[PDB]
Amino acid sequence: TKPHVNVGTIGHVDHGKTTLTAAITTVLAKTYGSHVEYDTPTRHYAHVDCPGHADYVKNMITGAAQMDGAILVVAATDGPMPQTREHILLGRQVGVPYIIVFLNKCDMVDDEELLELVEMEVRELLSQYDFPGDDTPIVRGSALKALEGDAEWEAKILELAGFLDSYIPEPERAIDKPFLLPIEDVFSISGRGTVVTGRVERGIIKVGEEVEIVGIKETQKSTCTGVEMFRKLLDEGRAGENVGVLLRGIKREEIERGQVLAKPGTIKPHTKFESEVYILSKDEGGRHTPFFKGYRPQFYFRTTDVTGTIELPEGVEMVMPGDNIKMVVTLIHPIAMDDGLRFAIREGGRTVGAGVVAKVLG
């Protein structure tokens, strides 16, 4: 019943990221009653550490972990590092909206003013990359001192957790979003009429509402006669539920799979768009043969495939497997789409890779 927030650690290797998250788990468990997940009294957290840059680029594109916030571990004994700029840069590139900073090993610091130097330098680093360096939370402390059971030091971990809850907002609920459902099948019933079946992705649909069926063909509108599951006939279409939707006035032959039933004006059909994609390697079950400008694969959006052609960014020609690349895809026919949507790349039913739409185009 509690919300779910995906976070992660980023920074230098020996700066104590691991020790920090270990301290997090231990203290949080000690106080309030491959990845590590823990719990606050309010929301649950899933912590993921990135072994590299392209590792979490890939991990972001595949949709495995979309990081809402990340803590930046920097040692005060050292201070910022030459590769920290690349860390924050990766922060912007992956598009993580919030970054919290934790200064580690502050006990070994000689003077407060030095800690102020490190602070101002880090805030400079964040300000350069467009993160709110001045408004960003920084918490001093020691993970090593936290694990040993010292309460005064554990308080800093709880401070970091409090900042983790307060500074990072709750991800928008499915209900809070406007109504969308993918259409898997269409039926024409005698004495009932046309009904489309599916699982509502977001929003709520209620009887009497005017809904817009948008997809391959030219977008059209019809009103909801009813909503029902197997057991009961329902008044409402609440998101996440697997249901079917009675439509009024529309014919079974006028609706295709791949089309969506959405709140009018909220979603639009599109053809050309630019996206960041990842292509599976041979051992990952993808193609062992690289591709080029004339690539013509299938793109799976939520229900069915749509053939599309791609064009590569300037500076790249060959695309080998096992790597991620931004590319511009133009479909042969329009699919209703929003930015941030995830799609699959398929050849004859075999998934060779996946992608996420960045910027929609005309």
Binding site: R85, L114, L117, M318, M320
Partner: protein, 278 residues
């Protein structure tokens, strides 16, 4: 004072407390501090040397009919994209090309005093992995990411031709140029391997011998650049493309980051729980 420490750190890039203690032992003298840090940098690298460097970059550059390809490795993905690491790799590369250095140990020992400072500054173990050269009449060089790069020298054809050929090399990983140029030891290795597969399949002497003898014919072409199907035009092989443009290839070298390293695995959750077990 602190305002001096920030000056030292801004001048060097060494760690905060390292600069603090260096300035403490130097009694305020800056140049003395940087000297002591300079002499501490060696052991500072020596302690980190035990770590394995999986990541890195492949730099390649050509001088006229002469060319040089090089791998230099670090232990993280971010350091490889750092400006200092890039400038260092470019420095050693340009020095290798202009100096025509075919010996790895030589220029590895040459830049050591710089590499230990770059290590002390970065905080990760970095070192020059390997270096090689290639010479031919027309040589193209293709770079796919910073992870993999190829240097291809051939006679005739054109720059675009050797560009595409280089891309094909980077993609297909050819061991040899022509099926005739294949090694005998390699052939014997695969011969005995496939023969062992054949005999483990319950097949008699003659049958196995003939089968494997037939298999080597295809294997040689598979491991050879000439026999491989051209990436750009899979409808034809590479040698057919060469014959079409009437040109031959003298040599090629392909480098990829992390070859032979094996990249020792690590688990985050296990480490976390391990520290939570103390």
């Amino acid at each position: 004072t602190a305002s001096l420490v920030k000056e030292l750190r801004e001048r060097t890039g060494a760690g905060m407390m390292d600069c603090k203690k260096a300035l403490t032992e130097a009694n305020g003298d800056i140049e003395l501090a940087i000297e002591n840090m300079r002499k501490s940098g060696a052991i500072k690298a020596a302690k980190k040397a035990g770590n394995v460097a999986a990541d890195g970059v492949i730099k390649t550059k050509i001088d006229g009919n002469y060319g040089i390809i090089l791998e230099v490795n670090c232990q993280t993905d971010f350091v490889a994209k750092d400006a200092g690491f890039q400038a260092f790799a470019d420095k050693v590369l340009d020095a290798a090309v202009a100096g025509k250095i075919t010996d790895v140990e030589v220029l590895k020992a040459q830049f050591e005093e710089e590499r230990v400072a770059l290590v002390a500054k970065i905080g990760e173990n970095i070192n020059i992995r390997r270096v090689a050269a290639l010479e031919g009449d027309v040589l193209g060089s293709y770079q796919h990411g910073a992870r993999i790069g190829v240097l291809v020298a051939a006679k005739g054809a054109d720059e675009e031709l050797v560009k595409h050929i280089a891309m094909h090399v980077a993609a297909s990983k050819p061991e040899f140029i022509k099926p005739e140029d294949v090694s005998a030891e390699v052939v014997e290795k695969e011969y005995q391997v496939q023969l062992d597969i054949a005999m483990q399949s319950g097949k008699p002497k003659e049958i196995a011998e003939k089968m494997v003898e037939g298999r080597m014919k295809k294997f040689t072409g598979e491991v050879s650049l000439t026999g491989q199907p051209f990436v750009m035009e899979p409808s034809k092989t590479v040698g057919q493309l060469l014959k079409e443009h009437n040109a031959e290839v003298t040599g090629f070298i392909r480098f990829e980051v992390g070859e032979g390293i094996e990249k020792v695995e690590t688990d985050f959750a296990a480490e976390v729980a391990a520290m939570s077990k103390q």
